[PDB]
Symmetry: D2
Subunit: 363 residues, 4 copies
């Protein structure tokens, strides 16, 4: 009959903590068969050797499989598990659980929150950071929009993707097959994977025309970007998982989503603009926030508003860790809550040094 | 007639003196009137941060050549306070304080003023205890007088350089038969910072003397100063007090105001400090000379009821994270990450918070 | 009454990699019901916020439970899972699987293994006499499980023990209790140290009248020469594996040990090999694994030469100590896939640590 | 014409500690006017943002200038200052001071320690890791051999070089000038600068023919390497500084140098081979060591002897920090002393995963 999306932001005590989700299931507030996606902030380093992402997915998949009486492998085929590592600064570990119920009710007036999920095929290592990833992601984004019953791309406000990275072993498998990889470096491969995935969002939504996107433009032409893509790389998968979040005229959700784009890492004005776009017009209405979701990164210029910083020179602390701490702190200072989703590395996601920011709010 | 000038100077590296040299070579700064240099240097801001000494050496070398004295004398004449750690978007820079007496008339009100005072040297067993507290309090009174400030409510930022305890000083304490406050050189810094900060609060009436004892030091976190900013040093044995405030008798074109961050994300306190310094709208933000704040990880492991990993993160020291967060918050209010944020905030603001001062053009 | 111990050192590709173990099970080399302990090196940071330890245990427990037709909870009650994080330098992630079976074969002493667990500890008990005394009780139980009655026949006592987090310190405070130290990284040292003194108490290496709360992590002249202790967020009790030789053993393996006097003491590595029957480089192929403790000396030096391990705010000293000692061992035996664990409080002298070798006879 | 070289390995308490050197000057054992080079291990992180290197050089240059009655600027023009950061593991901070003077003395008669020094021109950021750096380094190595009175490249046993790196500001400036740098990554720029400099050595010594070296080979063809090159990058200089160390028939030194090549990071055999090449035939004779100098690195394969390690995957600790800790520990365990010189990053310095190792010893 009618889609109704409920979103639960759940504090976690550890990557493997399923207790808050279990409380909501046990109380009858979540039917686990209606979960379609879980988006986590896990407390690993959010870079290459972050195993909290996999640990969190395994733990949730094992728990839900037992609850649902199905195998873990069926759970991971059915539910998107997108775990973004790195909870630096004051950023609080948590998961955001997306539930799509089928209700009898009519659609609420206007446009209300809608979510769609799509998975791509697995990518050969030589496809990462290249047009094969771009185009396959684009196809999956359009599929997820249809899942969400969003026709108009302007009603898409956040597209969250988990994507792969290159391991030493995967690079070796490509060269054994006579193939070269976009970059011979696992950490840099995260940026190419993130960037190609974000451009696929842009292509699917009509934010960028197809004839402007080529292999040579990926992670080079920062004039090209999506205003809603949020992409995250990890070792624990070989394809891209896509969650489209937007508003549909055919939805019974008591929620909406809105967004803006941070022009740089300290752009609080963009945080307030994203809150306003989600219907939050005053400080007292911030208790309607369900979550804030944003991308953060170090600007290639090595500066913010003409002021130097050491993020790209600091050999002790990787720059995506620093960018996550900063943007989370800025958002937290606006909304009074550090338990918000901030993901680092914003290649072709907002301008160079900035990133999209979305707000899911109660109506 | 007292006049204080303040120059916030971006730096390209710990040893970069070009910005300061430019202002000296143009006549805008006379090196003889420099009383203090407050630096953010881009090392890790923790134990093995050599950028603090590198920056001090580089500045002392340059200023000793320009004043014709030795760098040993320069370090005695000028207070070098180097706070390492430029995490997140925090921009390395130095802030140079110049104090001169000019022949201009009275102040149209109260204007920026600085005073300085020194304590006696502290026997190792005296650090972290009422001896240091009480002596620091006297010194603040002297510096207030030196600044020509007679209302404590006109003190807005009290820089202190305070000593610590070393092994040779540990043995000197048992060579006399008396133990020290703590059997650790790292914690002695936190006990020295806290004691000196409580001495500030005592001197200014921020807390009643009846509440301060050796047992409350670094335990009674409800006791704190709202203006003290302390840093533990290896070279001095006394306390170096620099009072910054507003005096009715000053020719400065600058004022100082302050507030207290109740926690690491308290942007409300940042705006209050700005308003206390005469910046009442986003349009007037260009009048900022610098913002000076303290950051620290809350002992509870939480901010506004939300857990964070600062105290559990074995890869990144928690003081580095606290500095990144507070810098980011202030920068998002003022639009400029080139502000001074230091760590180590015992009895400086509440647990998990810290004082925040703003120096602004009139 | 006759037990035979088999030990498999298995390279891993990630913390959750069970494929090498599954291969040994599917080939019939390991009956999974006979597994009694797994000792891993997992590739997290080996400090407080290392979740690779828990990830590895969870993955092994899930796999074994499915293979055995029992619950994960029953598996973790039956099998010791001790995951030591930190694979710094060239140290190679792997697991060591201990299998023990009853056999009927009929001189001399051969490898014996025993396992015991303690009760869970309250945060305010870590690093204090309650942990020492409960560990000591469990060590004696593990010795009986190993059928070792003479403490001189115990060559390595491997323990996993808890640590403090900020959240657990707050729990303690809310209950009106003070913890032994408020620094979460230093809490690992107190848990390791109290656990190691519990070994020394149980084995008679130190008398009880010499152990008190005030000695724990202060009197470095108190130590066990066989204790090897490892802390992690993933458990709230202590798990013990006693490894030694017994006359009631039909194993084709033996264990020997020595003590490294400092982090570069290759002579001690060669003495541990010789104690395990490996008399020359030409016999190194009989090594099953080498197991060692490493640490920064409290003096900040090695043979009078200063180092920065205790002063380095970017890299904790147990990470550096593990890289160093693994490198030294690897350069002697030609193989970096050996077990090295950092933090050797009351485990060998200040700056050193026990080192054991399991070898084919 | 006889040159006498003396070498003093001096423990340090901090990067700025000159007290050990001053003691030797004040006792008359060192004439400061005869210092030609100082090779240091300084206790910063050895990567991009290591300011202990420049702090040590500034401190040493200021001390020597006041001792010699000349300007700091003139001290740095006359004395090579090569500060290698990173004192990980048990590696002990120290400096090695090379004193060289002409002497009226008789034959050796064997070959004895010889040292030469040369400096290149400053490089533009866009010249680093490219043939401009290779070729200018090669010219300087030839000049330094001549200064050392070595005409037979087989009598060269160690060629120590300090070279530049790229920072974010230098990369961005290059972009504003319309110029592309060899790599857009500050940490990786160190590898390209070390590697080009090392191929400069191989070209100069005839270890590799010029026709095999091109931009495309640099940090790509690991079959190309020098067996005596030791290169070290730093933020604190814009040129390359070269110290050639070998033995000469025209030397009156009481010291000799020998070398070998570590095949991998745990090759203690090569440590013993280098000792033997320096005349140290047993443990009894290790009291004749003046210093041991070695290059260390992570192998591109991510393994040692077929065994995986995480050096290339660890986003928390850069691989050159790990490699230095490992190789210093191996050497210390052979010679019983961790106060030896180990530099990380051995691109075209020994095979992939290994590096040269030299021993300076009393005869
Ligand atoms: O990753 C990176 N990119 C740019 O443009 N500059 C530096 O220094 N690092
Ligand atoms: O300063 C320095 N040290 C080391 O070990 N390697 C480089 O490239 N630079
Ligand atoms: Ca962006
Ligand atoms: Ca405070
Ligand atoms: Ca020990
Ligand atoms: Ca090499
Ligand atoms: Cl001014
Ligand atoms: Cl940070
Ligand atoms: Cl505090």
């Amino acid at each position: 009959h009618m889609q109704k999306v409920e979103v639960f932001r759940i504090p976690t005590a550890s990557p493997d903590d399923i207790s808050g989700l279990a409380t909501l299931i046990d109380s009858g507030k979540i039917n686990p068969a209606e979960i379609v996606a879980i988006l986590g902030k896990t407390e690993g380093n959010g870079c290459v050797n972050d195993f909290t992402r996999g640990f969190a997915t395994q733990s949730l998949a094992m728990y839900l499989a037992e609850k649902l009486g199905i195998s873990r492998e069926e759970v991971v085929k059915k539910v998107a598990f997108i775990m973004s590592g790195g909870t630096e600064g004051v950023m609080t570990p948590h998961i955001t659980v997306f539930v799509r119920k089928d209700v009898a009710a009519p659609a609420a007036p206007g446009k209300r929150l809608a979510v769609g999920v799509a998975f791509t095929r697995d990518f050969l290592p030589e496809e990462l950071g290249r047009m094969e990833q771009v185009n396959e992601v684009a196809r999956a984004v359009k599929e997820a929009m249809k899942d969400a019953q969003i026709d108009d791309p302007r009603d898409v406000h956040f597209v969250q993707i988990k994507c792969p990275l290159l391991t030493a072993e995967r690079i070796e498998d490509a060269k054994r097959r006579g193939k070269d990889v976009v970059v011979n470096d696992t950490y840099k491969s995260m940026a190419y994977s993130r960037g190609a995935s974000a451009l696929g969002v842009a292509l699917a939504l009509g934010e960028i025309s197809a004839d402007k996107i080529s292999n040579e433009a990926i992670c080079h032409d920062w004039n090209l970007y999506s205003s809603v893509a949020s992409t995250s790389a990890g070792v624990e998968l070989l394809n891209d998982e896509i969650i489209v979040v937007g508003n549909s005229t055919n939805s019974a959700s008591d929620l909406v989503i809105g967004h803006s784009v941070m022009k740089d890492a300290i752009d609080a004005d963009a945080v307030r603009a994203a809150l306003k776009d989600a219907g939050i017009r005053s400080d007292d209405e911030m208790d309607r926030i369900v979550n804030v979701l944003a991308k953060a990164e170090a600007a290639s210029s090595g500066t913010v508003r003409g002021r130097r910083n050491t993020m790209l020179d600091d050999s002790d602390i990787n720059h995506t860790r620093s960018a996550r701490a900063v943007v989370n702190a800025v958002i937290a200072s606006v909304v009074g809550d550090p338990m918000v989703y901030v993901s680092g590395g914003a290649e072709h996601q907002g301008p160079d040094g900035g990133g999209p920011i979305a707000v899911i709010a109660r109506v």
